[PDB]
Amino acid sequence: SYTLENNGSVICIPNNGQCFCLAWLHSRGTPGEKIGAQVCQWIAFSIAIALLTFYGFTCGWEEVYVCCVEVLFVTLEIFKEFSSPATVYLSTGNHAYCLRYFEWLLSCPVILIKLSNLSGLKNDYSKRTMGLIVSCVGMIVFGMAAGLATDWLKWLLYIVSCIYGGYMYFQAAKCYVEANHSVPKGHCRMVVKLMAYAYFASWGSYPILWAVGPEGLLKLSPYANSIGHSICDIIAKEFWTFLAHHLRIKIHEHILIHGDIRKTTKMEIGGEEVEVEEF
Amino acid sequence: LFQTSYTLENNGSVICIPNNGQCFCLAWLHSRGTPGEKIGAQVCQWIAFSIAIALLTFYGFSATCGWEEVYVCCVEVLFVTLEIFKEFSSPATVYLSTGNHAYCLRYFEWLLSCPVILIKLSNLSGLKNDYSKRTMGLIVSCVGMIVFGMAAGLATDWLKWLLYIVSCIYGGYMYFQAAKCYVEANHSVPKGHCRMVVKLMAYAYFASWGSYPILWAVGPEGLLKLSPYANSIGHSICDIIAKEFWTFLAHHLRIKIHEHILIHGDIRKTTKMEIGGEEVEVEEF
Numbered sequence A: 001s002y003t004l005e006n007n008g009s010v011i012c013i014p015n016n017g018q019c020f021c022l023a024w025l026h027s028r029g030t031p032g033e034k035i036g037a038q039v040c041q042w043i044a045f046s047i048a049i050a051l052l053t054f055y056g057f058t059c060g061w062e063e064v065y066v067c068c069v070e071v072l073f074v075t076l077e078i079f080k081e082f083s084s085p086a087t088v089y090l091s092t093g094n095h096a097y098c099l100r101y102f103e104w105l106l107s108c109p110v111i112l113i114k115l116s117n118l119s120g121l122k123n124d125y126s127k128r129t130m131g132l133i134v135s136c137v138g139m140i141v142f143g144m145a146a147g148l149a150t151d152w153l154k155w156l157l158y159i160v161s162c163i164y165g166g167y168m169y170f171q172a173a174k175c176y177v178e179a180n181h182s183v184p185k186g187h188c189r190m191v192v193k194l195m196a197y198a199y200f201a202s203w204g205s206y207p208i209l210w211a212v213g214p215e216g217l218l219k220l221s222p223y224a225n226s227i228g229h230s231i232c233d234i235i236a237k238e239f240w241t242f243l244a245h246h247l248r249i250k251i252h253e254h255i256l257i258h259g260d261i262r263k264t265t266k267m268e269i270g271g272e273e274v275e276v277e278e279f
Numbered sequence B: 001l002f003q004t005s006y007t008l009e010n011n012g013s014v015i016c017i018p019n020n021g022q023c024f025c026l027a028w029l030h031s032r033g034t035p036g037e038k039i040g041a042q043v044c045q046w047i048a049f050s051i052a053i054a055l056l057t058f059y060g061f062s063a064t065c066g067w068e069e070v071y072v073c074c075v076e077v078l079f080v081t082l083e084i085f086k087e088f089s090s091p092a093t094v095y096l097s098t099g100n101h102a103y104c105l106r107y108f109e110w111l112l113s114c115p116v117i118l119i120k121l122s123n124l125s126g127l128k129n130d131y132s133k134r135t136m137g138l139i140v141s142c143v144g145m146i147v148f149g150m151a152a153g154l155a156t157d158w159l160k161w162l163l164y165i166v167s168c169i170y171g172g173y174m175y176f177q178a179a180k181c182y183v184e185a186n187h188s189v190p191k192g193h194c195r196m197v198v199k200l201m202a203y204a205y206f207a208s209w210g211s212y213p214i215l216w217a218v219g220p221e222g223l224l225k226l227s228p229y230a231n232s233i234g235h236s237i238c239d240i241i242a243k244e245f246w247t248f249l250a251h252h253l254r255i256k257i258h259e260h261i262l263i264h265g266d267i268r269k270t271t272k273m274e275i276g277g278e279e280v281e282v283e284e285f
């Protein structure tokens, strides 16, 4: 595709108008790693289609939107993952997977909008809901910039992203505590706890996968990193929204057979005191 | 950085560069604008820089009442500073293997500021716990709008304009939701000075927000009429209106409503209104 010159110090290429960089030609992963990515992609696709069909087509727009985004994303990844602009190849020699950051920006705020109102629909939206959304957006923005950036700048932006993420994780964790005391005593408290465990395990893995992936320490290949992101998406997008959809109807069914008995009880969760709904 | 040194050798159809692991593309060496446009860009940058700092000093630093104005102007201070010193360095400006370039620093600016503006717009009146369901429709539609706009700038050829249209569909739903907020804000603030402020915020919002898709389609990520410097002039003027003039009025409005209630007392009446063909409950003074 090119030609050497001198003693390897000069390289010549055709003047055809196509950008050239040897650093863009690195391998994508091993044959076994590719097969695993294909397997997990089609599982994530097939589960989303099923969950879309289960949800239907309003109350419950969040789950639909998240799963619609998963279908679109996983479909574009199956067919045109390493094509620009799904994967961007920068003049600095590196590359970034912009298709994935776009996915996060569409779905992560919605998941958090669902989290701030897990229990019986309290239309009064708090200042906490805004704190989740704003911190999540800032987190992904500085994450995406760190993926495009290079050398020390990359890790400076990465750290800024972790600061945003911390506030988001903090606010998200306070939701799960308030959500627990706000749902019926039996089966509903377990689902909230299972949703919390699924949320932190999946959402906690992305920074780890980022730092060792092809946009960080270059340990994991793109194909390998794809397997890891597919599994997190299955838990964060599909398993979690199913539990959220399930939690709603179980709360509705409990109310029609028990009523709507609620007392305003005040307690402390984070560094403050909050009054929450109690059955 | 890319390669700026090369030699057009052979008949001109074969080019040679030093083999130093440095990416090379002639399409990246395009002009950034004229000396006049360069100056006009720098004038508008330092104006936005200075107004943002004055507003930040004016609002003062008190999850507080008025966090939106501070965050927006903080995003302004960070964006303009990075644009003044490192506008055309990567990743502020990204140069793709497809020959095109994109101003990612601007999309980052939008993603940080545009939702917060709409969060403020969702609650233009006083008090708290006023967001509800329109807010989410504003945020989700605004975010999707920027996301598909960013993808459009990264892409080339027909895909770019496909992504552009999808962004406009997102934007139209957002613009629609936004207009109903101003209609409801009019009927929920004191019938004197505050409604003139709300109407002025509405004009500034649409005139500034409506100009970004026009600048985009015509600038260096579109039909290539406006240079990067020229396109910077237009964006700075829109930012001064969208982020600085608009948040000052939002900050001013909140004072005027609080000063009104402090002397007039809190009196209200719930009115079942038709906003965009539906039953909306808007409380009036």
Ligand SMILES: CCCCCCCC/C=C\CCCCCCCC(=O)OC[C@H](O)CO
Pocket (backbone or CB within 6 Å): A038, A042, A043, A046, A049, A078, A079
């Ligand atoms: C009810 C609505 C139904 C909607 C339709 C649902 C279709 C499910 C498709 C595949 C499932 C997984 C089967 C495994 C697919 C292997 C595909 C393959 O050959 O590999 C991918 C290829 O390499 C990439 O270009």
Ligand SMILES: CCCCCCCC/C=C\CCCCCCCC(=O)OC[C@H](O)CO
Pocket (backbone or CB within 6 Å): A131, A132, A134, A135, A138, A160, A163, A164, A167, A168, A171, B063
């Ligand atoms: C080369 C230089 C590149 C630029 C590098 C400098 C960037 C500094 C900006 C912000 C610091 C991080 C502040 C993170 C703000 C999070 C606070 C927040 O918004 O959350 C509020 C909370 O959730 C409700 O209480």
Ligand SMILES: CCCCCCCC/C=C\CCCCCCCC(=O)OC[C@H](O)CO
Pocket (backbone or CB within 6 Å): A047, A234, A238, A239, A240, A242
């Ligand atoms: C190798 C390990 C395989 C792990 C694969 C994890 C896939 C999770 C995907 C989506 C979540 C869907 C969860 C919903 C599953 C149905 C369970 C259910 O709720 O059924 C209720 C009914 O009462 C009982 O018959």
Ligand SMILES: CCCCCCCC/C=C\CCCCCCCC(=O)OC[C@H](O)CO
Pocket (backbone or CB within 6 Å): B046, B049, B050, B053, B057
């Ligand atoms: C309570 C705290 C009160 C704080 C009070 C505010 C302090 C302002 C500080 C720094 C601004 C100085 C930077 C001013 C930038 C203007 C530069 C300019 O005018 O443009 C010329 C250009 O730099 C030619 O290269």
Ligand SMILES: CCCCCCCC/C=C\CCCCCCCC(=O)OC[C@H](O)CO
Pocket (backbone or CB within 6 Å): B039, B042, B043, B044, B046, B047, B050, B051, B052, B054
């Ligand atoms: C809070 C309100 C304060 C608002 C601010 C008050 C107005 C500042 C004056 C002029 C605008 C910018 C100054 C124009 C100078 C730009 C620098 C420049 O033009 O230098 C280019 C030169 O060609 C390099 O070689």
